[PDB]
Design a binder for this molecule. Sequence first.
Ligand SMILES: [Mg+2]
Ligand SMILES: [Mg+2]
Lengths: 134, 52, 73, 113, 64
Amino acid sequence: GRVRTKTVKKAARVIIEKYYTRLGNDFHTNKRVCEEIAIIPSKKLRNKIAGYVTHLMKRIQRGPVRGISIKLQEEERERRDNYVPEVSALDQEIIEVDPDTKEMLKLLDFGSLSNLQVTQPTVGMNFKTPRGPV
Amino acid sequence: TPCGEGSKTWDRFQMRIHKRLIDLHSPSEIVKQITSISIEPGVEVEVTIADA
Amino acid sequence: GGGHVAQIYAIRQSISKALVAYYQKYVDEASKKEIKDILIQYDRTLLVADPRRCESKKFGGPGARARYQKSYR
Amino acid sequence: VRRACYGVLRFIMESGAKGCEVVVSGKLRGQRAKSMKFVDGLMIHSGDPVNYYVDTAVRHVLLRQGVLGIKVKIMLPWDPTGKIGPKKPLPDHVSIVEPKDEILPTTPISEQK
Amino acid sequence: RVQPIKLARVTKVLGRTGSQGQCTQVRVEFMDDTSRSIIRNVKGPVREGDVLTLLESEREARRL
RNA sequence: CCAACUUCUUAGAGGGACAAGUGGCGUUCAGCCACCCGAGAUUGAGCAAUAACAGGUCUGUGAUGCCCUUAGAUGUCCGGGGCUGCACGCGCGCUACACUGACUGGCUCAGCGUGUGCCUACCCUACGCCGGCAGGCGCGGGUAACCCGUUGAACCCCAUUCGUGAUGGGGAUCGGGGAUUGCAAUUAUUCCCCAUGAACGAGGAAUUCCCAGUAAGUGCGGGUCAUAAGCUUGCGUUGAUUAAG
RNA sequence: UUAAAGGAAUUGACGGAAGGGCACCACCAGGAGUGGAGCCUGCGGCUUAAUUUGACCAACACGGGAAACCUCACCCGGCC
Ligand SMILES: [Mg+2]
Ligand SMILES: [Mg+2]
């Protein structure tokens, strides 16, 4: 009998989007911010919106919820763009191939242009997983 | 219901009427210029007879 | 107000919390907390008012919940 | 009954109405009565705000056969805060205000006035 | 013939049964070793964890 | 000015409760479950969609179509009578079958609300005296938080009598008398008094309603009302048992 | 002799067809009963000059319908 309706949830996700720096993990202060910054037409859904606002205060300070607010979003510009490594994941200059794929680059005239020490395929033909339910 | 058919339903109409009261030590001539400052159709104001 | 039984619960509540609000004002709350220690663990209702009330009648029965007897045949 | 109801349904909605619906019931073309209703817009039905956001008017039309029944109701807009529409906005929606662009939060600068 | 009337403690209640929501299943422990535990059915309000008395010890639970 | 105050009373504005706080569960989502604090962690209701029913109402309506009758009028009024007539069946109820009681006397607590009217005649009643009761006269008050009224309600409480009996349980049936309303009381309007004192000993199949101030017991007030409630609608009081081809 | 019979899909409604829910106008655990008796009051039947009539879960203390007359329709008379 607790479960909050659409108009309470959609009006509280628009608060936390747009006034996130002015909020906190207390109920009685967030009740007063939304009182002063949003036109609520009664007292009952006022603090019922403010309840779900504080519910999202602890919810998004633990991680990236559907959270288009600035600070959680600008911090992932230091993940997609930052961590470019000082040494590459590609440039190791010691990489392995197989005797058939070196024949592929042999007609590409890249046989001796490369270093490319080879590994051999372990000779079984044990692919194509066994059939039937057990 | 406008007849006897139905399921024994009843509607409950009510009219709450309010009443307030104020004494004054006023002269009975300036009472009218306190009376002539509101139109306010939904009230009913009465002034007590001056003999007290 | 009330009845023969609802008044002696009300005066029981009254004289129990009257000296509590006397002791929170004219002596310290250290004595008050010591005696409200007694008057809470033993049946809390000596200084809190019981909220439940008359719970009005409806238009289909003799009381508020029950109904008149339904007949079919 | 179909030409007359459209001219009135077009006329409420062009006067600035949040929604309206008209029901005309009676002996139409045919000997058994039926009801043509011509709903439009949004209209609330339950609660107390359908006491002052709506006005209802039920009238009768005495024709040569039977009697028709007109039933018109308009849902009134909140906007004017004045003559044509009510105050006290609809209780299930929230008007949030947009904040300002938040210039000068940076490094300190002091004046004397 | 005479079985010892064995008092018994319930662990986790396995939900209602009995085609009318009248009987519940308790899987008692036997008050001598909690290793030795059988599934049983009782009626009335149960209150998980408490102790109930068995006039008969082991026949069957709700199982076709 | 030979006192202040607002606790209780009355409202008015504002506050407060949001699953907010703490543990557990769940995709650590929505949420659920416990506890804390608190007056309260689900008070009770009003409105209430789309599409309908050959549901009910022409006997609510100067809402109304068509048909019928319209002066020896199915219009309207007056006198009388009937809708109450009883071998029977059924439906909502009221009082009961008793000692967890009935009498008699004591002692003690309510809430909701209503009251003199345009036509409209009649309202609620305190006190004082006549009567044994129903009632009757005098004298007031009230258009009402001002008077009835601090609404001295019943149950219950405390004492007395009765003792397992169709009993002092139950009060149907019925005779005689007395009052009040009304133009009129017989086919008893109602009320009062003395008498008469019937079934009924807890109710087969079947079935109804209901989870907390609930059910049930108990009275009280609106409606109807000149006269009047076993009805309904409200109120407290005692209080539980478990388609892009 | 006859204007349909029929096919394939669609939405319904229904199933003594499955799965998931829910409600004391459903049940369980219970309570108070009702159904038995006396009376009150409504309905059918009977009888009647007339016993006016509406309605048969969602009719039956319901037409707010507790009619002495009036209401009042119905029956017996007389006026206007
Ligand atoms: Mg009519
Ligand atoms: Mg006895």
